[PDB]
DNA sequence: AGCAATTTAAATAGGGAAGATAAGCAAAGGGTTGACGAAAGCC
DNA sequence: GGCTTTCGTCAACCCTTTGCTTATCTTCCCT
């Protein structure tokens, strides 16, 4: 009598960011929006591969895409548009009955602090991945339906209580609890410094002469929307022995650390979804994790 | 001293691609030799050989099956069954743009020869296919061998048929040496004693099984000897090239 | 020729010669045609006699 | 109102880093294309 | 006495997934 998940069950992304375009401004005249071009440089060094103490001194020439602030502007600006979409339990590819019993298994999830963690990850500047390391201050300006919100000092590791993140998260959770959508026009101003080096997203190219190739929109330095969205959904502090917020994944998995924080401890998304559709009463953190996966999206079947 | 008339880019569609039971595709040299003797009958210009090349040729269908023809209820006495679909006997159809080059011997001006060949081709039918279009035929002569090659290269671009001969049989060498098989003629099995259901009552008739030779496609300029591309009626109830087996 | 049809189908399926067409001869139910069409229902192998094309853009 | 000069040489070399991954679903239909033989009204 | 219509009769598969060829070009020479 177990309610098996359909193979075709798939949820769409309901937090849609745009490609985060990266401009250069000063800290005073932020309207002087000059775009940061990706340049290409070729750099000489040494090959210091772990298992090669022979090629060590031979030399190493690498062609890398670089992006820097110009030497007349000390502030990096990052412009993007988060798009929180409601209707969060209607799986656009899933079955009707399984998605309906998952919806009526997850009506009581606290959307307020889910939306607070999303808007906090926007406001504290987690969408600036390496662009926050080394900065006098990080000013986040979010336009939410003709309402400008200003953010100066927010520690990104823990989700502190403040009234502006809660104010934006009020209509973000109102969207995520029901229908409609809300658009967050985000502008980040990092006082990086005069001629400082900025960190755009890097593309994967297989057979290319470039060692590192950055993402460029018509030549302008930019971040990928998936990197920005990963930084939105980096809210998971509810897994086993949680010390830092990780990205919401179906297996709680990060690739760089080489460990899945929710695989092998029956806290992965699929076990809690099968528990939700089979009468196991979920916890508040557990429901919040499952709903965060449902608005991250993904196909969950087979 | 040799004379030729070339009809270039003979776009023909509706070609009966069923060359035989085991060959479907390009019409064989028996078809084009039959076309040559057809003009020997209608126009009176008696034709020794025909060299034919394929500019374009597509058999209607997929890469493994030909598109069958929706048959029409045309036999007598099967009314009542006419509302249902007619049964399909296998006849693949094809389209083809050809280039033909007829060895003729002529004693008048080239204009009346061109007009006679044009008036034939306007009423002709290449392999059961309606001749959709054709360029104005032009007369070229092969006084010597360099002039023979001039006529040869005047059929550009086309893939002519060269005979490569039978070693053991058709299937074996088609896999081994990878050459194409086609009908070079027929083999007579039995005399036909009933001439009532035939085209003529006086012309002697035989049941036949198509003999095949193995052939290759080479572009007309890459053919060294034009006599190896000119097919003609041999005296073995078959057709053959003037130059014999292509080497 | 019947030997050509049957032996060619068997050989060109045996010797992996795939430059061919396949035709079921009798139709929907080939037992009214011929015993070989009745039994070899997969169709007879005939030679794909298409010549090479001339590319127009040259 | 066209006239604008000739030769001569264009740098040798050393390097172009590896380590990770490259999803799992579920679909992919049949509908016509039958000729001989045998009852059986019908000129 | 054929003759033309319609109904009954007799069956049963192992498939394979592009090349075939591959285009018609300057030396002497003197006017």
């Amino acid at each position: 009598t177990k309610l098996k998940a359909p193979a075709v069950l798939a949820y769409s992304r309901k937090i849609n960011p745009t490609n985060a375009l990266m401009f250069a401004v000063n800290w005073s005249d932020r309207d002087n929006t000059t775009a940061v071009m990706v340049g290409t440089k070729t750099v000489a060094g040494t090959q210091s591969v772990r298992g090669n103490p022979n090629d060590a001194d031979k030399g190493n020439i690498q062609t890398v895409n670089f992006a820097n602030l110009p030497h007349n502007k000390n502030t990096l600006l990052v412009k993007y548009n988060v798009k929180f979409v409601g209707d969060v339990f209607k799986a656009e590819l899933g079955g009707g009955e399984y998605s309906n019993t998952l919806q009526t298994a997850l009506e009581n999830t606290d959307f307020g602090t889910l939306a607070y963690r999303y808007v906090y990850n926007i406001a504290a500047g987690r969408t600036l991945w390496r662009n926050r390391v080394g900065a006098e201050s990080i000013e986040t300006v979010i336009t939410v339906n003709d309402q400008t919100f200003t953010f100066s000092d927010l520690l990104v590791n823990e989700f502190d209580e403040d009234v502006d993140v809660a104010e934006i998260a009020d209509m973000v959770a109102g969207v995520l609890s029901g229908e409609g959508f809300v658009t967050l026009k985000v502008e980040h101003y990092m006082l990086l410094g005069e001629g400082s080096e900025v960190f755009p997203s890097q593309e994967f190219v297989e057979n290319s002469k470039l060692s590192k190739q950055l993402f460029d929109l018509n030549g302008q330095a930019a971040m990928h929307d998936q990197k920005i969205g990963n930084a939105i959904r980096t809210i998971d502090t509810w897994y086993e022995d949680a010390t830092t917020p990780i990205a919401v994944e179906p297996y709680g998995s990060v690739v760089r650390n080489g460990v899945a924080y929710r695989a092998g401890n029956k806290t992965d998304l699929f076990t809690l979804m099968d528990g939700a559709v089979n009468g196991k009463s979920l916890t508040e953190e557990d429901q919040m994790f499952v709903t965060a996966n449902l608005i991250r999206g993904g196909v969950f079947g087979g | 001293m040799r004379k030729f008339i070339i009809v270039k880019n003979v776009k023909v569609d509706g070609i009966n691609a069923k060359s035989s039971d085991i060959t479907v595709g390009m019409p064989p040299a028996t078809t084009f030799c039959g076309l040559g003797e057809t003009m020997s009958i209608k126009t009176g210009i008696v034709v020794k050989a025909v060299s034919y090349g394929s500019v374009k040729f597509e058999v209607r269908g997929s890469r493994f099956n030909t598109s069958v023809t929706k048959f029409a209820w045309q036999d007598r006495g099967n009314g009542g069954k006419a509302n249902n679909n007619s049964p399909i006997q296998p006849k693949p159809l094809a389209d083809g743009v050809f280039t033909l080059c007829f060895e003729v011997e002529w004693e008048d001006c080239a204009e009346v020869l061109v007009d006679k060949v044009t008036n034939f081709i306007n009423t002709a039918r290449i392999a059961g296919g309606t001749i959709a279009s054709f360029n104005k035929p032009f007369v070229k002569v092969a006084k010597d061998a360099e002039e023979l090659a001039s006529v040869k290269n005047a059929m550009m671009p086309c893939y002519v048929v060269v005979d490569c001969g039978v070693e053991v049989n058709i299937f074996e060498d088609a896999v081994n040496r990878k050459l194409q098989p086609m009908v070079n003629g027929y083999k007579k099995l039995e005399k036909i004693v009933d001439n009532k259901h035939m085209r003529d009552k006086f012309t002697p008739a035989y049941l036949a099984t198509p003999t095949y030779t193995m052939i290759g496609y080479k572009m007309v300029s890459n053919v060294d000897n034009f006599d190896q591309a000119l097919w003609q009626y041999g005296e073995n109830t078959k057709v053959k090239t003037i130059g014999g087996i292509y080497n | 020729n019947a030997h050509n049809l049957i032996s060619g189908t068997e050989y060109l399926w045996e010797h992996k010669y795939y430059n061919t067409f396949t035709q079921k001869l009798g139709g929907s139910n080939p037992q009214n045609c011929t015993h070989a069409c009745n039994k070899m229902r997969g169709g007879f192998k005939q030679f794909n006699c298409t010549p090479p094309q001339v590319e127009d853009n040259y």
Side-chain angles (χ1 to χ4, degrees), chain A residues 2-57 59-302, chain B residues 1-142 144-145 147-247, chain C:
Chain A
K2 201 93 166 314
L3 194 35
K4 197 56 138 293
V8 80
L9 185 93
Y11 285 81
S12 83
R13 178 202 322 126
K14 304 297 209 29
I15 308 171
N16 306 264
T18 69
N19 294 312
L21 269 195
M22 304 184 29
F23 305 93
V25 287
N26 265 336
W27 196 248
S28 46
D29 61 7
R30 302 182 174 164
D31 85 87
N32 244 23
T33 307
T34 88
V36 171
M37 298 302 82
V38 162
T40 302
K41 78 155 170 307
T42 279
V43 57
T46 57
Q47 16 196 7
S48 335
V49 228
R50 180 161 269 261
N52 224 146
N54 321 298
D55 268 71
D57 37 79
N60 230 13
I61 314 295
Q62 306 298 322
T63 306
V64 281
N65 268 359
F66 77 106
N68 277 65
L69 287 181
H71 270 107
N72 58 337
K73 271 128 187 303
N74 50 3
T75 306
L76 172 65
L77 161 59
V78 164
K79 285 193 54 35
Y80 63 100
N81 296 327
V82 202
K83 183 77 71 63
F84 292 89
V85 182
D87 198 57
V88 304
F89 303 118
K90 182 196 157 358
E92 90 290 337
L93 199 73
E97 165 290 338
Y98 189 85
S99 306
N100 272 312
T101 187
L102 201 62
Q103 176 156 212
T104 197
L106 304 156
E107 53 276 60
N108 272 12
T109 89
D110 156 80
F111 278 99
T113 88
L114 279 181
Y116 196 104
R117 287 165 123 115
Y118 290 139
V119 173
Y120 194 90
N121 275 346
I122 302 173
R126 201 172 285 237
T127 68
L128 317 150
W129 273 99
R130 216 165 148 211
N131 310 273
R132 33 186 318 104
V133 317
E136 277 70 21
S137 81
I138 300 162
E139 183 38 78
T140 299
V141 172
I142 314 180
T143 315
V144 190
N145 49 264
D146 312 359
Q147 216 156 340
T148 309
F149 290 86
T150 326
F151 301 99
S152 268
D153 273 332
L154 295 88
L155 319 88
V156 86
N157 248 34
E158 85 283 338
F159 305 94
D160 300 308
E161 268 66 33
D162 63 321
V163 317
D164 274 8
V165 178
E167 203 165 9
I168 302 175
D170 230 347
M171 71 224 78
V172 172
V175 157
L176 288 188
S177 282
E179 312 274 323
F181 78 104
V182 58
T183 303
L184 274 77
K185 299 193 163 39
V186 196
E187 275 151 335
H188 289 283
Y189 303 98
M190 294 129 285
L191 193 55
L192 287 186
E194 205 59 85
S196 151
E197 181 289 357
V198 306
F199 297 98
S201 201
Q202 179 182 351
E203 310 165 308
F204 176 14
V205 280
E206 290 93 0
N207 311 290
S208 191
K209 65 112 190 184
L210 272 155
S211 166
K212 149 160 96 155
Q213 180 175 317
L214 302 167
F215 181 43
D216 54 284
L217 276 189
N218 314 137
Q220 188 195 327
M223 314 198 77
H224 289 128
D225 62 0
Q226 60 258 11
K227 214 168 161 39
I228 303 301
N230 186 82
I232 314 303
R233 84 172 173 274
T234 323
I235 77 183
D236 217 61
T237 67
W238 322 304
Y239 58 95
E240 193 145 290
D241 313 352
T243 49
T244 206
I246 88 166
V248 168
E249 295 305 312
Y251 273 141
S253 49
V254 296
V255 187
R256 313 161 180 310
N257 316 343
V259 60
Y261 291 100
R262 282 167 179 266
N265 48 27
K266 34 174 203 45
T267 67
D268 50 59
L269 165 71
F270 311 105
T271 43
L272 327 169
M273 281 185 38
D274 303 328
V277 306
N278 292 304
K280 320 203 44 50
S281 172
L282 301 194
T283 88
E284 203 45 72
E285 286 87 42
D286 181 290
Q287 283 164 50
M288 262 175 58
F289 161 75
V290 171
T291 318
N293 270 282
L294 289 199
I295 58 186
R296 156 215 192 266
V299 54
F300 323 120
Chain B
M1 202 295 308
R2 315 191 71 190
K3 326 169 204 64
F4 300 86
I5 168 154
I6 308 181
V7 201
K8 273 184 63 212
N9 281 66
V10 194
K11 201 216 287 310
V12 186
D13 43 358
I15 284 138
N16 303 338
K18 208 189 97 57
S19 171
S20 90
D21 247 2
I22 62 173
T23 52
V24 157
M26 175 100 169
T30 60
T31 300
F32 295 91
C33 281
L35 172 95
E37 59 92 6
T38 299
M39 27 177 358
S40 104
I41 281 151
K42 324 292 291 313
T43 60
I45 85 184
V46 57
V47 183
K48 312 179 277 317
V50 47
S51 168
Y52 63 96
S54 86
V55 193
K56 309 303 255 270
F57 199 86
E58 314 208 21
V59 186
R60 289 142 90 152
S62 89
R63 74 141 301 161
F64 283 148
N65 289 72
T66 70
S67 90
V68 317
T69 317
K70 291 240 305 176
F71 268 36
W73 280 106
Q74 56 182 16
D75 283 348
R76 181 184 329 255
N78 41 26
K81 315 194 306 185
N83 36 24
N84 320 339
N85 287 70
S86 177
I88 314 295
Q89 313 303 329
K91 34 168 298 182
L93 281 186
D95 309 4
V97 190
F98 300 118
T99 295
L100 326 163
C101 175
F102 309 103
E103 218 147 301
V104 293
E105 60 294 10
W106 193 238
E107 294 332 325
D108 292 20
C109 84
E111 290 40 38
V112 298
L113 169 62
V114 161
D115 201 9
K116 269 169 146 301
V117 169
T118 313
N119 286 23
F120 166 71
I121 285 298
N122 282 316
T123 81
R125 193 97 79 82
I126 307 268
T130 87
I131 298 177
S133 86
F134 62 104
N135 292 132
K136 171 135 170 323
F138 58 95
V139 185
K140 272 181 67 42
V141 145
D144 34 272
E147 268 245 273
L148 180 71
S150 196
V151 178
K152 181 176 65 83
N153 289 12
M155 301 155 77
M156 281 314 316
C158 75
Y159 278 99
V160 287
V161 169
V162 294
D163 199 341
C164 296
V166 172
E167 276 83 342
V168 278
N169 51 316
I170 163 173
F171 316 118
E172 264 268 320
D173 81 336
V175 180
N176 305 333
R177 68 198 202 115
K178 250 325 266 132
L179 249 352
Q180 226 126 356
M182 67 102 144
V183 184
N184 62 336
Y186 302 90
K187 142 179 308 305
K188 309 192 162 357
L189 311 182
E190 338 308 335
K191 182 42 61 182
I192 298 190
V193 290
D194 190 77
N195 45 354
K196 167 147 26 60
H197 311 308
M198 301 230 168
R199 313 171 82 174
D200 314 350
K201 325 196 41 55
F202 35 74
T203 307
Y206 313 72
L207 292 184
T209 280
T211 63
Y212 319 90
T213 191
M214 310 283 316
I215 59 115
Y217 289 114
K218 250 235 168 342
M219 270 282 212
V220 78
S221 90
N222 296 317
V223 182
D224 41 17
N225 193 10
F226 193 40
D227 284 358
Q228 269 145 359
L230 282 143
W231 290 87
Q232 60 159 17
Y233 274 120
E235 195 60 41
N236 209 25
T237 200
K238 296 212 253 217
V239 309
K240 74 181 192 298
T241 48
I242 315 183
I245 303 300
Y246 195 87
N247 285 336
Chain C
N1 177 220
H3 158 74
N4 267 342
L5 276 174
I6 304 163
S7 147
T9 317
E10 240 171 43
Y11 179 85
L12 299 185
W13 278 117
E14 148 165 290
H15 266 231
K16 314 282 192 33
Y17 184 80
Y18 299 182
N19 191 32
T20 36
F21 288 125
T22 302
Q23 163 94 60
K24 306 160 205 296
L25 283 183
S28 66
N29 45 2
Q31 70 277 358
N32 39 49
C33 178
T34 285
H35 267 289
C37 307
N38 175 43
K39 305 305 299 184
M40 329 179 32
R41 294 273 176 129
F44 285 95
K45 210 101 155 180
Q46 30 200 144
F47 282 101
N48 185 4
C49 278
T50 324
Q53 306 295 291
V54 169
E55 304 88 348
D56 42 18
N57 285 352
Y58 221 72

Coordinates of all heavy atoms in Angstrom, one line a residue, chain A residues 127-171:
Chain A
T127 N 25.2 35.7 -3.5 CA 25.3 35.6 -4.9 C 26.6 36.2 -5.5 O 27.0 35.9 -6.6 CB 24.1 36.4 -5.5 OG1 24.2 37.8 -5.3 CG2 22.8 35.8 -4.9
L128 N 27.3 37.0 -4.7 CA 28.7 37.4 -5.0 C 29.5 36.2 -4.4 O 29.6 36.1 -3.2 CB 29.0 38.7 -4.4 CG 27.8 39.6 -4.6 CD1 27.7 40.7 -3.5 CD2 27.8 40.2 -6.0
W129 N 30.1 35.4 -5.3 CA 30.7 34.2 -4.7 C 32.1 34.4 -4.2 O 32.3 34.3 -3.0 CB 30.7 33.1 -5.8 CG 29.4 32.4 -5.8 CD1 28.3 32.5 -6.6 CD2 29.0 31.3 -4.9 NE1 27.3 31.7 -6.3 CE2 27.7 30.9 -5.3 CE3 29.7 30.7 -3.9 CZ2 27.1 29.9 -4.6 CZ3 29.0 29.7 -3.2 CH2 27.7 29.3 -3.6
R130 N 33.0 34.8 -5.1 CA 34.3 35.3 -4.6 C 34.4 36.8 -4.7 O 35.5 37.3 -4.3 CB 35.4 34.6 -5.4 CG 36.6 34.3 -4.6 CD 37.5 33.3 -5.3 NE 38.9 33.6 -5.0 CZ 40.0 33.4 -5.8 NH1 39.8 32.8 -6.9 NH2 41.2 33.7 -5.4
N131 N 33.4 37.5 -5.2 CA 33.4 38.9 -5.3 C 33.2 39.6 -3.9 O 33.3 40.8 -3.8 CB 32.3 39.4 -6.2 CG 32.4 38.7 -7.6 OD1 33.1 39.1 -8.5 ND2 31.6 37.6 -7.7
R132 N 32.9 38.8 -2.9 CA 32.8 39.4 -1.5 C 34.1 39.3 -0.8 O 34.3 40.1 0.2 CB 31.7 38.8 -0.7 CG 31.5 37.3 -0.9 CD 30.3 36.8 -0.1 NE 30.2 37.3 1.3 CZ 29.3 38.2 1.7 NH1 28.5 38.8 0.9 NH2 29.4 38.6 3.0
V133 N 35.0 38.5 -1.1 CA 36.2 38.3 -0.3 C 37.2 39.5 -0.6 O 37.6 39.7 -1.8 CB 36.9 36.9 -0.6 CG1 35.8 35.8 -0.5 CG2 37.6 36.7 -1.9
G134 N 37.3 40.3 0.4 CA 38.1 41.5 0.3 C 37.1 42.6 -0.1 O 37.0 42.9 -1.3
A135 N 36.6 43.4 0.8 CA 35.6 44.4 0.6 C 35.4 45.2 1.8 O 35.1 44.7 2.9 CB 34.3 43.8 0.1
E136 N 35.5 46.6 1.7 CA 35.2 47.4 2.9 C 33.8 47.3 3.3 O 33.5 47.2 4.5 CB 35.6 48.9 2.5 CG 37.1 49.2 2.7 CD 38.0 48.5 1.7 OE1 37.5 48.2 0.6 OE2 39.2 48.4 1.9
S137 N 32.8 47.3 2.4 CA 31.4 47.1 2.7 C 30.7 46.6 1.4 O 31.2 46.9 0.3 CB 30.7 48.4 3.2 OG 30.4 49.2 2.2
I138 N 29.6 45.9 1.6 CA 28.8 45.4 0.5 C 27.4 45.9 0.6 O 26.7 45.6 1.6 CB 28.8 43.8 0.5 CG1 30.2 43.3 0.4 CG2 28.0 43.3 -0.6 CD1 30.3 41.8 0.9
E139 N 27.0 46.7 -0.4 CA 25.7 47.4 -0.4 C 24.8 46.7 -1.3 O 25.0 46.7 -2.5 CB 25.9 48.9 -0.7 CG 24.6 49.7 -0.7 CD 23.7 49.3 0.5 OE1 24.0 49.7 1.6 OE2 22.7 48.6 0.2
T140 N 23.8 46.1 -0.8 CA 22.8 45.4 -1.6 C 21.5 46.2 -1.7 O 20.9 46.5 -0.7 CB 22.5 44.0 -1.0 OG1 23.7 43.2 -1.0 CG2 21.4 43.3 -1.9
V141 N 21.1 46.6 -2.9 CA 19.9 47.4 -3.2 C 18.9 46.5 -3.9 O 19.2 46.1 -5.1 CB 20.2 48.7 -4.0 CG1 19.0 49.4 -4.4 CG2 21.1 49.6 -3.1
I142 N 17.8 46.2 -3.3 CA 16.8 45.3 -3.9 C 15.5 46.2 -4.2 O 14.9 46.7 -3.3 CB 16.5 44.1 -3.1 CG1 17.8 43.5 -2.6 CG2 15.7 43.1 -3.9 CD1 17.5 42.3 -1.7
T143 N 15.1 46.2 -5.4 CA 13.8 46.8 -5.8 C 12.8 45.7 -5.9 O 12.9 44.8 -6.8 CB 14.0 47.6 -7.1 OG1 15.2 48.3 -7.1 CG2 12.8 48.5 -7.3
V144 N 11.8 45.8 -5.0 CA 10.7 44.8 -5.0 C 9.4 45.5 -5.1 O 8.9 46.1 -4.2 CB 10.7 44.0 -3.6 CG1 9.8 42.8 -3.7 CG2 12.1 43.5 -3.3
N145 N 8.9 45.5 -6.4 CA 7.6 46.2 -6.8 C 7.5 47.6 -6.3 O 6.6 47.8 -5.5 CB 6.4 45.3 -6.5 CG 6.3 44.8 -5.1 OD1 6.7 43.7 -4.8 ND2 5.8 45.6 -4.2
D146 N 8.3 48.5 -6.7 CA 8.4 49.9 -6.3 C 8.6 50.0 -4.8 O 7.9 50.8 -4.2 CB 7.2 50.7 -6.8 CG 6.8 50.4 -8.2 OD1 7.6 49.6 -8.9 OD2 5.8 50.9 -8.7
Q147 N 9.6 49.3 -4.3 CA 10.0 49.4 -2.9 C 11.4 49.1 -2.8 O 11.8 47.9 -3.0 CB 9.1 48.5 -2.0 CG 8.8 49.1 -0.6 CD 7.6 48.5 0.0 OE1 6.8 47.9 -0.7 NE2 7.4 48.7 1.3
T148 N 12.3 50.1 -2.6 CA 13.7 50.0 -2.5 C 14.2 49.6 -1.1 O 13.8 50.2 -0.2 CB 14.4 51.3 -3.0 OG1 13.8 51.7 -4.2 CG2 15.9 51.1 -3.2
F149 N 15.0 48.6 -1.1 CA 15.6 48.1 0.2 C 17.1 48.1 0.2 O 17.7 47.8 -0.9 CB 15.1 46.7 0.5 CG 13.6 46.6 0.8 CD1 12.7 46.5 -0.2 CD2 13.2 46.6 2.2 CE1 11.3 46.4 0.1 CE2 11.8 46.6 2.5 CZ 10.9 46.4 1.5
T150 N 17.7 48.5 1.3 CA 19.1 48.8 1.3 C 19.7 48.0 2.4 O 19.2 47.9 3.5 CB 19.3 50.3 1.7 OG1 18.2 51.1 1.0 CG2 20.6 50.8 1.1
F151 N 20.9 47.4 2.1 CA 21.5 46.4 3.0 C 23.0 46.6 3.0 O 23.7 46.6 2.0 CB 21.2 45.0 2.5 CG 19.8 44.6 2.4 CD1 19.1 44.7 1.2 CD2 19.1 44.3 3.6 CE1 17.8 44.4 1.2 CE2 17.8 44.0 3.5 CZ 17.1 44.0 2.3
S152 N 23.5 46.8 4.2 CA 24.9 47.2 4.4 C 25.8 46.1 5.0 O 26.9 45.8 4.4 CB 25.0 48.5 5.3 OG 25.0 49.7 4.5
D153 N 25.5 45.6 6.1 CA 26.3 44.7 6.9 C 25.5 43.5 7.3 O 24.8 43.6 8.3 CB 27.0 45.3 8.0 CG 28.3 46.0 7.6 OD1 29.0 45.6 6.6 OD2 28.7 47.0 8.2
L154 N 25.6 42.3 6.7 CA 24.9 41.1 7.0 C 25.8 40.0 6.9 O 26.3 39.6 5.8 CB 23.7 40.9 6.1 CG 22.5 41.9 6.2 CD1 22.7 43.0 5.2 CD2 21.2 41.2 5.9
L155 N 26.1 39.3 8.0 CA 27.0 38.1 8.0 C 26.3 37.0 7.4 O 25.2 36.6 7.7 CB 27.4 37.8 9.5 CG 27.8 38.8 10.5 CD1 26.7 39.4 11.3 CD2 28.9 38.3 11.4
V156 N 27.0 36.4 6.4 CA 26.3 35.5 5.5 C 26.1 34.1 6.1 O 25.2 33.3 5.6 CB 27.1 35.4 4.1 CG1 28.2 34.4 4.1 CG2 26.1 35.2 3.0
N157 N 26.8 33.7 7.1 CA 26.8 32.4 7.6 C 25.5 32.1 8.4 O 25.0 31.0 8.3 CB 28.0 32.0 8.4 CG 28.9 31.0 7.7 OD1 29.1 31.0 6.5 ND2 29.6 30.2 8.5
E158 N 25.1 33.0 9.2 CA 23.9 32.8 10.0 C 22.9 33.9 9.6 O 23.2 35.0 9.2 CB 24.2 32.9 11.5 CG 24.3 34.3 12.2 CD 25.6 35.0 11.8 OE1 26.6 34.3 11.5 OE2 25.6 36.2 11.9
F159 N 21.6 33.6 9.8 CA 20.5 34.4 9.3 C 20.0 35.2 10.4 O 19.1 34.9 11.2 CB 19.4 33.4 8.7 CG 19.9 32.5 7.7 CD1 20.3 31.2 8.0 CD2 20.0 32.9 6.3 CE1 20.8 30.3 7.1 CE2 20.5 32.0 5.4 CZ 20.8 30.7 5.7
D160 N 20.5 36.5 10.5 CA 20.2 37.4 11.5 C 18.8 38.0 11.3 O 18.3 38.1 10.1 CB 21.2 38.5 11.7 CG 22.6 37.9 12.0 OD1 22.7 37.1 12.9 OD2 23.6 38.3 11.2
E161 N 18.2 38.5 12.4 CA 16.9 39.1 12.3 C 17.0 40.5 12.0 O 17.6 41.3 12.7 CB 16.1 38.8 13.6 CG 15.3 37.6 13.6 CD 16.1 36.3 13.6 OE1 17.3 36.3 14.1 OE2 15.7 35.3 13.0
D162 N 16.3 41.0 10.9 CA 16.2 42.4 10.6 C 14.9 42.6 9.8 O 14.4 41.6 9.2 CB 17.4 42.9 9.8 CG 17.5 42.2 8.4 OD1 17.3 41.0 8.4 OD2 17.8 42.9 7.5
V163 N 14.4 43.8 9.8 CA 13.0 44.1 9.4 C 12.9 44.2 7.9 O 11.8 44.0 7.3 CB 12.5 45.3 10.1 CG1 12.8 45.3 11.5 CG2 13.0 46.6 9.4
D164 N 14.0 44.4 7.1 CA 13.9 44.6 5.7 C 13.9 43.3 4.9 O 13.2 43.1 4.0 CB 15.1 45.5 5.2 CG 14.7 47.0 5.3 OD1 13.7 47.3 5.9 OD2 15.5 47.8 4.8
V165 N 14.8 42.3 5.4 CA 14.7 41.0 4.8 C 13.4 40.3 5.1 O 12.8 39.7 4.3 CB 15.9 40.1 5.4 CG1 15.9 38.7 4.8 CG2 17.2 40.8 5.0
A166 N 12.9 40.6 6.3 CA 11.5 40.1 6.7 C 10.5 40.7 5.9 O 9.5 40.1 5.5 CB 11.3 40.2 8.2
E167 N 10.6 42.0 5.6 CA 9.6 42.8 4.8 C 9.6 42.2 3.4 O 8.5 42.0 2.9 CB 9.9 44.3 4.8 CG 8.7 45.1 4.5 CD 8.9 46.6 4.9 OE1 10.1 47.0 5.2 OE2 8.0 47.4 4.9
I168 N 10.7 42.0 2.7 CA 10.7 41.4 1.4 C 10.2 40.0 1.4 O 9.4 39.6 0.5 CB 12.1 41.5 0.8 CG1 12.6 43.0 0.7 CG2 12.2 40.9 -0.6 CD1 14.1 43.1 0.3
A169 N 10.7 39.2 2.4 CA 10.3 37.8 2.5 C 8.8 37.7 2.9 O 8.3 36.6 2.7 CB 11.1 37.2 3.6
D170 N 8.1 38.7 3.3 CA 6.7 38.7 3.5 C 6.0 38.4 2.2 O 5.2 37.5 2.0 CB 6.2 40.0 4.1 CG 5.3 39.7 5.3 OD1 4.8 38.6 5.5 OD2 5.0 40.7 6.1
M171 N 6.3 39.3 1.1 CA 5.6 38.9 -0.2 C 6.3 37.8 -0.9 O 5.7 37.2 -1.7 CB 5.5 40.2 -1.1 CG 6.8 40.7 -1.7 SD 6.8 42.5 -1.7 CE 7.3 42.8 0.0

